[PDB]
Structures are given as structure tokens and as C-alpha cells.
């Protein structure tokens, strides 16, 4: 089973949002059994915690699932077929951890409007509900390219 994992720092806002969203989208496409989707954080200050109440709030506001258990990047995640970094800091950490460039890609590099320079997804933790809605929109705009990536991989 193909494995894609999203990575941010605390695994309570950005990455879990991308995880639930992409996983649900795959289910709608009937590809839920063929692709495993998870997420983790580079840090461990939230291991075991649910997603941020505001993150679950926006997910729910758009009809997506919210169940989540925060975790720090481990063996399981580093063994994914693709590690999706939320921002450039996450990417350099995963890179420096030993993951080759081809397996570390920033989420926004999948946005159809993306240029060679991939943009960061901002952390909404210290913002307001508006910031969480914006993070949702940014992620929503980037995922279509990840679906193409999955289609290419499943062909294998």
C-alpha cells in the first residue's frame, strides 16, 4: 500500500488538516484501500494530543473528519513513499534526517499554480479562526497535484 505522510512541527494544526483532507478525498475516489495517509510532527510537545480545536473546527466546517492523535516523526513515517513537508523548515529537517530529495516535497509544490519555488503553508496556531480557514484553503488548493502523484504511483 502506497504511503503518503504530511509533516509539520507539532502535528496538531497544519499536517493533520492536510492528512484528514487528503485521506477523505481519496475515499471519495475509491482509492482509500490503495493509499495509506498519515502525518507526524518534527517535535514531540504534543504526542498523543488531538488536533487543535480550531483545526477540527475548520475541517468540520468543510465536511471533513477530525479524529486525530498527534505523533512525532518516527520509523513508520520516514518509511513512507512520500514525505510532504508543510513548510521549508520541515523539508530541510527531513532532508537532513536522511530522506533523499525525491521523497521530500513541500505541499504547495503540488498546487497547479506552483513555480519552481514552493511556498510555505503558514502555521495558524497563534492566529484566529480566519487564519485556520486560510490554511484550509491553501491546502485545498495544493492537494490536486498530490492526487496526480498518486495516480502515477498506482500505475506502478
Q: Which residues are catalytic?
A: 8, 14, 123
- In the region spanning residues 122 to 141, those forming contacts with Cl ion, defined by CB under 5 A, are 123
Q: Of the candidates 9, 38, 42, 109, which one interacts with Cl ion according to CB under 5 A?
A: 9
Per-residue string for binding with Cl ion, 47-86, x by CB under 5 A? Answer: ----------------------------------------
- Measured from the CB atom, the residue of 11 and 109 that comes closer to Cl ion is 11
Cβ neighbors of 9 (< 8 A, separation 6 or more) are 41, 42, 43, 89, 90, 123
Which cell numbers hold the place of 85?
Answer: 513537508
Q: State phi, psi for 131 to the nearest 5 degrees.
A: -65, -35
Give all strands (DSSP E) within 63-127, no chain letters: 82-85, 104-106
> Using the rule CB under 5 A, is 10 a contact of Cl ion?
yes
- Measured from the CB atom, the residue of 8 and 82 that comes closer to Cl ion is 8
Q: Are 106 and 115 contacting, i.e. CB atoms less than 8 angstroms apart?
A: no
- Measured from the CB atom, the residue of 18 and 150 that comes closer to Cl ion is 18
Query: Residue 129: helix, strand or coil by DSSP?
Result: helix
- Residues lying near Cl ion in the complex (CB under 5 A) are found at 8-10, 123
Amino acid at each position: 500500500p502506497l504511503h503518503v505522510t504530511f509533516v509539520c512541527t507539532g502535528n496538531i494544526c497544519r499536517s493533520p488538516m492536510a492528512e484528514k483532507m487528503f485521506a477523505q478525498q481519496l475515499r471519495h475516489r475509491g482509492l482509500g484501500d490503495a493509499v495509506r495517509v498519515t502525518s507526524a510532527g518534527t517535535g514531540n510537545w504534543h504526542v498523543g494530543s488531538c488536533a487543535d480545536e480550531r483545526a477540527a473546527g475548520v475541517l468540520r466546517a468543510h465536511g471533513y473528519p477530525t479524529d486525530h492523535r498527534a505523533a512525532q516523526v518516527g520509523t513508520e513515517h520516514l518509511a513512507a513513499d512520500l514525505l510532504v513537508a508543510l513548510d521549508r523548515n520541515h523539508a530541510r529537517l527531513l532532508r537532513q534526517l536522511g530522506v533523499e530529495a525525491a521523497r521530500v516535497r513541500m505541499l504547495r509544490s503540488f498546487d497547479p499554480r506552483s513555480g519552481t519555488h514552493a511556498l510555505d503553508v503558514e502555521d495558524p496556531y497563534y492566529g484566529d479562526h480566519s487564519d485556520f480557514e486560510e490554511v484550509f484553503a491553501v491546502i485545498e488548493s495544493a492537494l490536486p497535484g498530490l492526487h496526480d502523484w498518486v495516480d502515477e504511483r498506482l500505475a506502478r
